[PDB]
Design a binder for this molecule. Structure first.
Ligand SMILES: *[B@@]1([O])OC2=C([C]=[C]C(F)=C2C([O])=O)[C]2[C][C]21
Ligand SMILES: *[B@@]1([O])OC2=C([C]=[C]C(F)=C2C([O])=O)[C]2[C][C]21
Ligand SMILES: [Cl-]
Ligand SMILES: [Mg+2]
Ligand SMILES: [Mg+2]
Ligand SMILES: [Mg+2]
Ligand SMILES: [Mg+2]
Lengths: 242, 243
């Protein structure tokens, strides 16, 4: 089904890394990946889980809108940007775990489980703490499963309101120029080996949309920038972005 | 809610032998800034900045079902090549595709167009002329400061049209985004009556504030259209709004 393009391995090998990029051409309904096996390997979603978590929190009114302020709890954490008040936009932008842990507690494990089943999300397993299972519990999702979920969100087909989906897609906005719009979410899974980085999302063109999902070995935080860099190299190689 | 006149911004205009006005509005502080209070309050044809209210009305009335609905090219080849193809709301805004918005306006009709603009408090609310061309050569006029007042309502979902229509139009206004800011805006270019001018109106979203802007400048030929964004960006950089 998917076409394998092993030449993209060159972009990982340049940085003494390994990983997978998965692309989906929405118009043609064709998929491409450098590694058919790793494309289907399920990992902790880590902070890419902020996408379904945001959708669920909005649909249940835990988050009223993208302006609602979630005040800092006063606990100083290692990521300076977390130590301040946030709304949905900035909590996504800075991947603010304590804000989303409060969402998850308010959602509760019964509703969290039902929504992930409704979303057909990964292995639909929330075993672990209700406020950390996407970092060190049972939930597992592959890059191709991320594409599936993102396609539903793009088409407003997920089992939540249209408004919720529109707001989350606004919150995913990452980059836009006159050539393309990227809506995406990064993730860095460090609590359980193997430590991996994620980038999942899509590229909007005038006449098409390319969905992507990538993950890569990430032993130290020094390489986090390679998630976007390698993905963009693949997008350029494939003539999706100039 | 006061105003400061900062005439040092004029250096960005005179560098290009241009003249114009930039108006900024700091939402958090409710403070306005401009290089020219007189011109900030002079009203002009909106030209294609009218695509913002026009999109809202078309969406709210169901003339546009959503941002994917295709509006077909009428087969008349026009000067701007990107016009000569099918469009949706996103690409029609991006390329300022007048023929698509003229079809919107004809479907909206005079009475509904007039009612909506009054309820929006949009400029002088005057649609005199052809319903599908009054923003190019009819009676509608709007000042840069009046553009801000309208845009602030849109940002806050305070217009009387649906929240959905307001969200879709703000998505369609997306012009630039990065790790430092988001710009939602619409360009305009008006030549059918004097003075010929370029517009750029919209806002800059920061982590913790929103800066609304509305600029216009003399545009004696189309050669200077790019100065609309470049001069605005120079002012935003001078004021430390963007890096
Ligand atoms: B999560 O996966 O998001 C995250 C963390 C640390 C560093 C990062 F770059 C990212 C990210 O990808 O946004 C921790 C909090 C979680
Ligand atoms: B409108 O004012 O928009 C427009 C036109 C021509 C060239 C442009 F750059 C622009 C603009 O400002 O987007 C014509 C169609 C109208
Ligand atoms: Cl957006
Ligand atoms: Mg390289
Ligand atoms: Mg299932
Ligand atoms: Mg200059
Ligand atoms: Mg009025």
């Amino acid at each position: 089904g998917w076409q394998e393009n092993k030449s993209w391995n060159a972009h990982f090998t340049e940085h003494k890394s390994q990983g997978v990029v998965v692309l989906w051409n929405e118009n043609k309904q064709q998929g491409f990946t450098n590694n058919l096996k790793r494309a289907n390997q399920a990992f902790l979603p880590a902070s890419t889980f902020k996408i379904p978590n945001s959708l669920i929190a909005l649909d249940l009114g835990v988050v009223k809108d993208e302006h609602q302020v979630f005040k800092w709890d006063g606990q100083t954490r290692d990521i300076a940007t977390w130590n301040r008040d946030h709304n949905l936009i900035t909590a996504m932008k800075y991947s603010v775990v304590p804000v989303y842990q409060e969402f998850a507690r308010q959602i509760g494990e019964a509703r969290m489980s039902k929504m992930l089943h409704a979303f057909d999300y990964g292995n639909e397993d929330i075993s672990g703490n209700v406020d950390s299972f996407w970092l060190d519990g049972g939930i597992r999702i592959s890059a191709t499963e991320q594409i599936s979920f993102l396609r539903k969100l793009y088409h407003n087909k997920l089992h939540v309101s249209e408004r919720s989906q529109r707001i989350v897609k606004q919150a995913m906005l990452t980059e836009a120029n006159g050539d393309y719009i990227i809506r995406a979410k990064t993730g860095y899974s460090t609590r359980i080996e193997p430590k991996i980085g994620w980038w999942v999302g899509w590229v909007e063109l005038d006449d098409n949309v390319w969905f992507f999902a990538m993950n890569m070995d990430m032993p130290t935080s020094d390489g986090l920038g390679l998630r976007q860099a390698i993905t963009k190299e693949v997008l350029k190689q494939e003539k999706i972005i100039p």
